[PDB]
A paper describes a structure:
To better understand the molecular basis for Tac1 NAD(P)+ hydrolysis, we determined the X-ray crystal structure of this protein to a resolution of 1.4 Å. Like metazoan ARC enzymes, Tac1 adopts a mixed α/β fold containing two lobes separated by a deep cleft. The N-terminal lobe of Tac1 is composed of four α-helices, whereas the C-terminal lobe is formed by a four-stranded antiparallel β-sheet flanked by two additional α-helices. This topology contrasts that of characterized metazoan ADP-ribosyl cyclase enzymes, which contain seven α-helices in their N-terminal lobe and three α-helices and a four-stranded antiparallel β-sheet in their C-terminal lobe. Despite low pairwise sequence identity between these proteins (18%), our crystal structure strongly aligns with the catalytic cleft of CD38 (Cα RMSD of 0.97 Å across 67 equivalent positions). Consistent with our hypothesis that this cleft forms the Tac1 active site, substituting any residue in this cleft with alanine profoundly reduced NAD(P)+ hydrolysis. However, only substitution of Glu573 with alanine completely abrogated NAD(P)+ hydrolase activity. Glu573 in our structure corresponds to Glu226 in CD38, which was previously found to be essential for the activity of this human enzyme. Encouragingly, Tac1 contains a second glutamate in its active site (Glu516) at a position corresponding to that of Glu146 in CD38. We therefore conclude that like metazoan ARC enzymes, Tac1 hydrolyzes NAD+ through a cADPr catalytic intermediate in a manner that is enhanced by Glu516.
Residue numbers in the entry: 252 to 399
């Protein structure tokens, strides 16, 4: 659970996934966490979210995973173990955020996307979250979708 134990490589393509081994590495500083899902007019994805987050002084799930020396299984909608691993990592990341949260959300989302079905409900249940603002991945339009 220690955020400073963040240097030794944890490679989940070579070991069994257990989210409790990375709970500390998934911690974030307040008012920095980003989420993302979907595309607008084809524009979006994990890399657009990473660029937007880093330009605004924040982090994403994937940037946190990379920066803390974790390798996740390749996500594939038809490989159950990788679906479960990403769902659990997303849930623990979301459990631990605080303050003002941002999300790069496209107008077209995949069925079963983790944002609508896992992460956003977790954030609404998180008393430490004070605001959720979406950012369109193509246009940059921002909307406050939740403010407690
Ligand atoms: Cl994903
Ligand atoms: Cl859905
Ligand atoms: Cl997803």
């Amino acid at each position: 659970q220690d955020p400073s134990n963040r240097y030794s490589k944890i490679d989940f393509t070579q070991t069994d996934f257990d989210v409790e081994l990375i709970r500390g590495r998934l911690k974030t500083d307040p008012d920095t966490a980003f989420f993302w899902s979907g595309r607008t007019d084809g524009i979006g994805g994990m890399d657009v979210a990473k660029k937007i987050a880093k330009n605004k002084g924040g982090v994403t799930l994937e940037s946190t995973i990379d920066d803390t020396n974790i390798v996740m299984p390749e996500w594939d909608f038809n490989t159950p173990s990788s679906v479960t691993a990403w769902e659990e990592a997303s849930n623990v990341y979301a459990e631990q955020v605080s303050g003002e949260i941002r999300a790069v959300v496209g107008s077209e989302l995949r069925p079963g996307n983790i944002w609508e079905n896992i992460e956003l409900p977790r954030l609404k249940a998180n008393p430490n979250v004070t605001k959720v603002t979406t950012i369109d991945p193509k246009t940059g339009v921002e909307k406050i979708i939740f403010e407690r």
